[PDB]
Amino acid sequence: RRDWENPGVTQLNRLAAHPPFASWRNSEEARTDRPSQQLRSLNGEWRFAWFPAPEAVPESWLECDLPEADTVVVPSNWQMHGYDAPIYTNVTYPITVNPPFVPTENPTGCYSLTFNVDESWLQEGQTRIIFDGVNSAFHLWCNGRWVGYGQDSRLPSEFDLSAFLRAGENRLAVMVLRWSDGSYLEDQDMWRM
Amino acid sequence: DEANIETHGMVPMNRLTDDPRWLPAMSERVTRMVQRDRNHPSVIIWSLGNESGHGANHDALYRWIKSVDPSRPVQYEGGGADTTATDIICPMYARVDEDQPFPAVPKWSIKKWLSLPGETRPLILCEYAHAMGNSLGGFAKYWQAFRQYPRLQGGFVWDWVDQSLIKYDENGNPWSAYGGDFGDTPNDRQFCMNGLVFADRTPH
Amino acid sequence: RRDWENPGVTQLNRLAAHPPFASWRNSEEARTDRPSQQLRSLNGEWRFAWFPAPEAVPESWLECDLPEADTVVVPSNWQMHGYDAPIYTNVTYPITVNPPFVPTENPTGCYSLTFNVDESWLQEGQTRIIFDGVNSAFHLWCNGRWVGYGQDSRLPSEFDLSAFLRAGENRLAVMVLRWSDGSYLEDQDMWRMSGIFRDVSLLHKPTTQISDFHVATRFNDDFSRAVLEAEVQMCGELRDYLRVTVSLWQGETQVASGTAPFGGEIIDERGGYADRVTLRLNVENPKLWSAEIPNLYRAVVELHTADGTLIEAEACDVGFREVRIENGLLLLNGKPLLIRGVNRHEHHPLHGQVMDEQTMVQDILLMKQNNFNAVRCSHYPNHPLWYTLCDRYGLYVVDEANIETHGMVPMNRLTDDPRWLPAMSERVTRMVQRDRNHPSVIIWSLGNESGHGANHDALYRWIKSVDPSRPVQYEGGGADTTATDIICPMYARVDEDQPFPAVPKWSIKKWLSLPGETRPLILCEYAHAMGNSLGGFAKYWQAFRQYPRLQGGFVWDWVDQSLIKYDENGNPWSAYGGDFGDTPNDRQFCMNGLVFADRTPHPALTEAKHQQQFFQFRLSGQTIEVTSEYLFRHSDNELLHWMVALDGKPLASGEVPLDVAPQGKQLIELPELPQPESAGQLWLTVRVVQPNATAWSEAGHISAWQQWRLAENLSVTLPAASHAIPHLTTSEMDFCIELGNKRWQFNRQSGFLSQMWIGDKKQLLTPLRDQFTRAPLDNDIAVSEATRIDPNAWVERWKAAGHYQAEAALLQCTADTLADAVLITTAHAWQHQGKTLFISRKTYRIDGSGQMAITVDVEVASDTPHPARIGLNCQLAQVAERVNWLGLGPQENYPDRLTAACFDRWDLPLSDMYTPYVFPSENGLRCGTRELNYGPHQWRGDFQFNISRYSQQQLMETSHRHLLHAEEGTWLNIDGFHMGIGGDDSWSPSVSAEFQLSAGRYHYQLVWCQK
């Protein structure tokens, strides 16, 4: 559906926004702002592959790692890893002004991660994923199944993965678009990454 | 705390912000920020975004926040720095004594701005003293005015740190790069370095 | 994708909203508002198939017609074709509340149409399809290719089909979902139906086109000068040779015209709109628009080239008027309005929610004829033609966004939620974009019964910012929130407060003066006209006229939402909630109108007409002072007719021309009042008559009336020497009286007049007995229910007290002979669970003249609920053609709803004495009657009465009027006193104290004699 060229679609299946949570299961920990066993970081080494347009991404990637991919640290801006150039423009948009469309050549970063989930997390309750910043829009898949979509590169996008994970290893697939209708609202005088 | 909404390159600047079809998208940028950050005491003022002109979408959103969170003023500089979508006169680069009477969106001397007919709001520059390179000349003139005039309550210098990026030479030595150094074009060259400090935090 | 369960997706590929377009290619056709060849109707016969859920729709349908489909007319509501049941639910959602999901079993209407498209429409320009109304959401395909999706059942959804059509035959496929996330914002109190219920059209526009236009009119201080400002926007390639001309016409006279190339003034640091232009036209001494005189001009907007070639033209009717709130008063053209309004849903008894011009005109005419000057679009934007009619006939309109979430708990659950902001914003913004050029719209409303949430505040400011020309109102959350410029409560009473927590409904007089309050107050709904209702209506009007800031209200509501059903024999009858097997439902709550579904008036309508009159009168001596409540016009189509009568007999009358300026006064001296020959009360009646026909009335229309008693000369003339003396015969069981050919029989064990004969003919089917109850009105029932009794309702109070079960117990039954008459004396008690409820003491005196004087003195225990009536009743053996009385009439009237009735001698056929309210109840009373004639009988006194073929017992046992059967004879209820009917609301006790029978002891007397 080209959700990234439609300002009427800024997200799909995204959870409501709310103040920082950690779901402590010990009140003392909450008092002192100690790390919470219920809030896990997925930061570190992920798999990534760069494509010139979303149309160039292979279906295979939904189910298995692309052997071509590289291993890189997340969080990161892919420009800083050399995959494409960062652009420094002040006022003038970096893409042609023709809202809400974007260029056909739209750099797409395919990120993926294989990670473990303990059954305890799945026997009871809700397991959600939190992406604190994704620039500029993206689709998310979990174990090959599509989960949702998000825009606004500067606020967290959260999705309920409860029904998508299984105990043990799991695989996330995140397709990140460089430009989207959200870019029309992101013309700050700064490097475009 | 400011909404991630900036449509500077549009012509005119409020093309999208005056368009109801863009109300939803804008609305999520403002509402999701308030829902996320409203319990932090350090946040004292909400901003509707930056350089996106003044459109009806701004008015709607300014009201939304006033309704949901009366505890903090709302400001917005677009459209002249003193529109109906701002509780604070918050110009960018208005001078101390010299007027710059641009049509539609003049930048009055800050001392004069406070007293235009019917005006009563406080004035805090959202951006002033553009610290690009060897700059900050006339800084003391702002400070003297801030101290003399009750309603001149200060401002936010533009800006903290140079947005220079590191590149490596043929010899592998690093060097500070700016607009156009990545093959990027068009680009705005050195305009990305306006800070009081170098990208590594050494002070200018 | 399931876009119908995602409030974040309210449409896909839908074009921007804009004012009504026709793409004329000739300016004169645009000026005259003639049919445009570029705007085609696709209404007529379509193909349709009903499915239980979208999942059952076969894919073949996208490409070809399903053979099982039927051919039906569009627009239509598929329920009105019998595919599924329409449901009548008031507050409770018709689907489980689980936002944003809808049931899986979701009735889906598959509509399709095979139609031709001319190559000329495709060779150049843009061809779009416009659906003015689709309930509640839909997907569109064209020639098997998907086009887009849309929600909001009350505004048009348009899609560009240029790239999907081919010259010749084409096929459209529309899959309409009964339920969608949109339904959560469509919980209005009305039948829940579905379908393509408003027009379907194809519009051809040039590639370079007018894409929007806004017209504003500002004035100098005394309205003697105006500036017409028309902002025009374009779509397409900008070219220096393009031009816009806006011309203004007053009939055939060109008043003004201006032309300019595109390119607006500088807006900000980035410039201005190169694709827009504003034309400014000066108008001297404009003819102003109001509901009083709806003067209109025509604005024509031409997009053309420099050389003069026209590209296209758009146009609208313009009314020069200013609406502002100042100093706490709503002003129109600088004068404070008095809104004589009504809420009007779009409803037809045969077509459901589909509207037609004929019906709209009929409504407007009846409205105007009944002295209404305003209408609230409860509770969604109306069919487009409605606005055009209001502009031209002259009605002030409140345009209201299609947002109602009454069923949520609490009411603002969705409106205070940011996630619902987008969906709500579209309902408001798209309405304003469509209707902002209509002069008849004077106030915008944010919707209805959706609590008060931050989304309202956001949208209130949006509107204030885009269109400063009209106030914004909204009742939710307590009627006086930060989202409304007008205090606009629903069912707040005149003097009585109802202090509900959080959202109290203060007396309207008190509300105005609460600490810090300064706004005007106009009720968005009041005087709920459900069944026999409108009691206390004059109390509102008296307050409106006395308090400047009380600026009127919108009665609830115009027309009963009954639907037609056919019985076994194919005969039609009026159905309400539950009548389609819909459950749960809200039964008769869908019928609250001043008129029946077919436009015939209910009696209440006349009370509204009289209290909403535009002339007030006072009497002093032979001086009648007429005051005009018009703000703008002189009384140039009015004469005053006066007539003086003695107890119904005309003595004199005359006519005087009315010449009163707006807000002025006129004194008329009546000529010397020749005495009169006879005892009796003289009565003066005046009527305002319009000699000339108008766009909304025929010559001779009566627009106002008033009465006064003049002198009275009490009869001091002692009767005469009775020709004879009646004889009394006593027996163990009875007291019989004989006089000439007449006989009266009193049963000694019951203590009532059980029979009366004229010659050998019995006149009674049931004895004459006291009656203290009435077949409960809708207002008496209120929300009480069988499966859930409301103990506070009047009907339940009376039931519980034993009023409908109490049986008469004899205390005394004696007979005495006097010199020229026989006197029967009786006493009875009515008791229940050993308590004495009522005691009735009577005397019957039968004299040589054959007149039977009945005296009745009743005691009502102070602790029993005040009774519905204190009267007598009986079933007469005969049936007669007419009913003739000297009392108030001619129509039905009750104590708290009798201002419109006039004291005179009325004569109607018996059936007119029965009011066919769909849900039967006590009805047809006439009060203030001094003489009643039926067949050979005459009753004299000062009483209220009803007479019909239906016993109260029947009326109370019967749910629908079509199931009533004439009983033998005629049931006559003659009351000394009758309780008010109430109506401030119909879900709580609403009869004012002053109309309750709480005096404890009552006396009344009547004379029954033969004619």
Ligand SMILES: CC(C)S[C@@H]1O[C@H](CO)[C@H](O)[C@H](O)[C@H]1O
């Ligand atoms: C250069 C002006 C027209 S825009 C000016 O440019 C600056 C460059 O650092 C900053 O981005 C300012 O916020 C902006 O107002």
Ligand SMILES: CC(C)S[C@@H]1O[C@H](CO)[C@H](O)[C@H](O)[C@H]1O
């Ligand atoms: C019955 C009340 C609690 S709600 C009451 O119901 C009416 C029934 O006609 C109307 O719909 C009013 O708008 C609504 O307030």
Ligand SMILES: [Mg+2]
């Ligand atoms: Mg999008």
Ligand SMILES: [Mg+2]
């Ligand atoms: Mg632990």
Ligand SMILES: [Mg+2]
């Ligand atoms: Mg496994």
Ligand SMILES: [Mg+2]
């Ligand atoms: Mg900028």
Ligand SMILES: [Mg+2]
């Ligand atoms: Mg350059």
Ligand SMILES: [Mg+2]
């Ligand atoms: Mg939806």
Ligand SMILES: [Mg+2]
């Ligand atoms: Mg309701």
Ligand SMILES: [Mg+2]
């Ligand atoms: Mg029910």
Ligand code: NA
């Ligand atoms: Na100061």
Ligand code: NA
């Ligand atoms: Na800069």
Ligand code: NA
């Ligand atoms: Na008034």
Ligand code: NA
């Ligand atoms: Na109703």
Ligand code: NA
């Ligand atoms: Na006249």
Ligand code: NA
């Ligand atoms: Na009944």
